[PDB]
């Protein structure tokens, strides 16, 4: 199965210049525990934006170009990605923008972060076509002295 990760402020923001402007504790502690072991694709963005192997994942970058790196797998299309991944369970897609518009068709499950902030960036989640989806986990926290916006994690698997 193939599944997409994203944490989204207000109108589908998800970064700005080249990183996130945001600092959620709560968020990334998701984000790991919901792709530690299994192998994880990014766009060269990306893996800028990070700057170092993801650990306890595979690392699978997207680009044109040959890789900078052979702590990670470098791979030039989507259809190597997935097969470069092997026969695993599932495939997490971890963006950013261009990455996610290309494997959306092709996923079967969202992980998704509401986060209540407004942030003017520069790059978006691709706006998914409501009826393709049914929510059935959804669970929101206030903010706290370790996370400055309220939240919500959110799963859908397509219908
Ligand atoms: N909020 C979140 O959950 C989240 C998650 C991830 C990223 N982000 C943010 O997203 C932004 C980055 O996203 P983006 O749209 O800029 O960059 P991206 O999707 O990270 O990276 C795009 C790059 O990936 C490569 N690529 C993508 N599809 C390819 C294909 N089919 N074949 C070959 N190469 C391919 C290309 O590299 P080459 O130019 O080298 O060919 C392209 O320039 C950052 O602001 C980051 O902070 C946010
Ligand atoms: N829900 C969600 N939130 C995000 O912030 C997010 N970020 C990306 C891409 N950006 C990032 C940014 C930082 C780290 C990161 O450093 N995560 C660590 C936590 C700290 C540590 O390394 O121990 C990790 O191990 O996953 C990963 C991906 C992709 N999907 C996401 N999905
Ligand atoms: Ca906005
Ligand atoms: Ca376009």
Same mark, same amino acid.
Do not use: R
């Given at each position: 199965? @193939?599944? =997409?990760?994203?944490?989204?402020a207000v109108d589908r923001v998800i970064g700005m210049e080249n990183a996130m402007p945001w600092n959620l504790p709560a968020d990334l502690a998701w984000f790991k525990r919901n792709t530690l072991n299994?192998?994880?694709i990014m766009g060269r963005h990306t893996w800028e934006s990070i700057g170092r192997p993801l650990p306890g994942r595979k690392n @699978?970058? =997207?680009?044109?170009q040959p890789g900078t790196d052979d702590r990670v797998t470098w791979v030039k299309s989507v259809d190597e990605a997935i097969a470069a991944c092997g026969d695993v369970p599932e495939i997490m897609v971890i963006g950013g923008g261009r990455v996610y518009e290309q494997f959306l068709p092709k996923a079967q499950k969202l992980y998704?972060?509401?986060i209540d902030a407004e942030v003017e960036?520069?790059?978006?989640?691709?706006?998914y076509?409501?009826?393709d989806w049914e929510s059935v986990f959804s669970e929101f926290?206030?903010?706290?002295?370790?996370?400055?916006h309220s939240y919500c994690f959110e799963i859908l698997e397509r219908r």
């Open positions: 199965m @193939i599944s =997409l990760i994203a944490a989204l299994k192998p994880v @699978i970058i =997207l680009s044109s998704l972060t509401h960036g520069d790059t978006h989640f691709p706006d076509e409501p009826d926290h206030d903010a706290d002295a370790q996370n400055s």
